[PDB]
Amino acid sequence: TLSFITRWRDELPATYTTLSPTPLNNARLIWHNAELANTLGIPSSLFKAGVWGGETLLPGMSPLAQVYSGHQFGVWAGQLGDGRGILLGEQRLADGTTMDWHLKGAGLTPYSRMGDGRAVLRSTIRESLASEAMHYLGIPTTRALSIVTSDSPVYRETVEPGAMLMRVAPSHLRFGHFEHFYYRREPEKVRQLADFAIRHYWSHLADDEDKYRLWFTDVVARTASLIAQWQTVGFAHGVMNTDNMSLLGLTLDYGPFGFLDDYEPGFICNHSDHQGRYSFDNQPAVALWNLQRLAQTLSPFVAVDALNEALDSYQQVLLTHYGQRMRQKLGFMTEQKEDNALLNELFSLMARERSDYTRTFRMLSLTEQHSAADEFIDRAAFDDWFARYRGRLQQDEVSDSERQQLMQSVNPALVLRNWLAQRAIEAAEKGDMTELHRLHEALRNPFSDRDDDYVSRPPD
Numbered sequence: 404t405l406s407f408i409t410r411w412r413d414e415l416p417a418t419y420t421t422l423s424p425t426p427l428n429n430a431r432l433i434w435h436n437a438e439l440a441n442t443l444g445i446p447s448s449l450f451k452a453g454v455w456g457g458e459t460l461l462p463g464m465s466p467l468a469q470v471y472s473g474h475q476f477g478v479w480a481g482q483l484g485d486g487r488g489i490l491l492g493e494q495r496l497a498d499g500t501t502m503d504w505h506l507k508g509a510g511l512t513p514y515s516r517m518g519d520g521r522a523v524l525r526s527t528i529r530e531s532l533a534s535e536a537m538h539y540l541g542i543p544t545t546r547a548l549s550i551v552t553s554d555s556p557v558y559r560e561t562v563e564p565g566a567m568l569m570r571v572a573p574s575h576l577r578f579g580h581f582e583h584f585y586y587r588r589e590p591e592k593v594r595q596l597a598d599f600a601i602r603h604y605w606s607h608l609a610d611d612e613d614k615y616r617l618w619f620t621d622v623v624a625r626t627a628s629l630i631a632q633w634q635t636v637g638f639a640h641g642v643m644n645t646d647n648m649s650l651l652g653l654t655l656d657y658g659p660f661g662f663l664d665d666y667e668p669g670f671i672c673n674h675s676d677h678q679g680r681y682s683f684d685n686q687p688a689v690a691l692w693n694l695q696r697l698a699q700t701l702s703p704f705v706a707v708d709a710l711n712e713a714l715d716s717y718q719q720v721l722l723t724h725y726g727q728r729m730r731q732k733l734g735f736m737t738e739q740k741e742d743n744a745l746l747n748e749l750f751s752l753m754a755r756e757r758s759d760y761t762r763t764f765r766m767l768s769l770t771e772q773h774s775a776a777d778e779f780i781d782r783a784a785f786d787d788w789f790a791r792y793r794g795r796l797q798q799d800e801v802s803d804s805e806r807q808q809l810m811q812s813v814n815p816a817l818v819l820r821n822w823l824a825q826r827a828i829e830a831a832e833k834g835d836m837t838e839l840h841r842l843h844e845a846l847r848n849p850f851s852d853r854d855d856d857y858v859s860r861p862p863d
């Protein structure tokens with residue numbers, strides 16, 4: 404009753420190795436995404452480790468591991484690839500969409516280099532929570548369908564339980580796929596990937612009547628829009644290597660990510676990123692640098708001129724999306740030219756006071772235009788900014804009430820803070836999944852107000 408196609412396998416020969424998952428020892432299902440399963444037509448009986456542990460294949464699957472390469476922290480890293488994951492198959496939905504089923508933690512692969520081919524419970528829990536949180540914030544992302552843990556030791560800085568995440572996404576194409584064949588000097592394979600992407604994900608483009616310029620122009624726009632959305636909610640990816648950039652503009656590969664607590668533009672959550680390359684405030688520039696690396700691979704068959712014109716459009720797209728999202732977050736229903744100074748003055752203040760990002764915006768969503776009605780060392784500077792902020796609000800001539808409702812629909816009450824995830828992980832390792840299930844539920848409603856500790860700052 405589920406329909407898998409062998410599209411990648413049949414259309415992109417020599418981009419993968421066929422092979423099967425390696426099962427863990429005493430694997431067992433600890434969580435699965437019941438809502439998403441209903442959307443994908445997966446019978447609920449399939450969840451009672453089976454395919455979620457890579458111990459069974461469903462009819463139509465033909466598992467392979469993809470090859471790719473990448474720049475890592477700005478330096479060419481050579482061959483990478485699906486070193487600890489496997490594309491089990493591609494499921495076609497009634498929508499006509501296809502959805503990759505990718506098993507992360509599936510065992511050793513020809514692409515594992517010196518890696519064990521395994522993922523650990525804590526990283527699979529964090530990735531499931533992050534990708535579902537992102538999805539309910541309305542930001543493009545891969546999705547999490549299931550987690551299995553095991554009794555199989557996996558050694559990181561300490562011994563951890565081996566685990567696997569069943570990841571679901573429209574595609575796993577990365578900028579690094581193109582880079583891989585470009586630097587191997589196989590420009591034909593580069594173009595094969597472009598044509599495949601256009602055929603299956605930009606089919607409204609008529610074949611070669613400007614298809615390549617228009618497609619890459621959309622690729623830029625989707626990455627700019629993705630970054631704009633991360634910035635707005637205070638998400639720091641932390642490992643924006645070119646192999647972790649999704650061609651479609653999906654958030655891809657959750658590792659040492661971080662949603663901001665205290666507002667700090669130079670926030671680094673990846674403690675291996677010693678130069679702060681992937682600090683929060685560099686994500687706009689880094690994503691442009693990554694697009695330029697992708698643009699490098701297409702110069703054999705796309706005019707270097709059209710490539711730079713598409714690269715040129717990046718900062719206007721990003722600024723359009725960011726500006727429209729911020730105006731909503733500040734409750735600006737119209738657009739006055741006071742807006743950029745009020746913003747710049749807010750972010751300057753928030754930074755000096757180390758204000759919590761999410762909480763500040765959610766509290767600002769209670770503002771009443773005519774009232775002056777506490778978290779700042781310099782209350783003098785706040786009430787002066789708040790004063791000029793509320794005066795500009797009155798210019799909208801819209802009610803206290805509908806501004807508040809607009810803001811509450813774009814400023815979440817809850818984000819996936821590191822200490823909420825940690826708490827679910829600690830409980831999970833002890834065999835209590837209740838916290839994990841409770842937190843996943845809460846993240847399906849980020850814009851709804853809460854009474855519990857899911858909306859508090861971390862305890863310190």
Ligand SMILES: Nc1ncnc2c1ncn2[C@@H]1O[C@H](COP(=O)(O)OP(=O)(O)NP(=O)(O)O)[C@@H](O)[C@H]1O
Pocket residue numbers: 483484485486487488514515516517518519520521522642646647655656657658
């Ligand atoms: N434990 C591991 N064993 C084998 N390969 C690994 C391991 N950890 C990372 N790699 C590979 O090292 C490269 C960089 O890792 P990373 O960007 O973190 O990807 P990943 O989290 O393993 N998989 P993904 O979410 O598909 O991008 C990729 O080729 C990974 O497949």
Ligand SMILES: [Mg+2]
Pocket residue numbers: 646647656
């Ligand atoms: Mg990766």
Ligand SMILES: [Mg+2]
Pocket residue numbers: 656657658
């Ligand atoms: Mg990773």
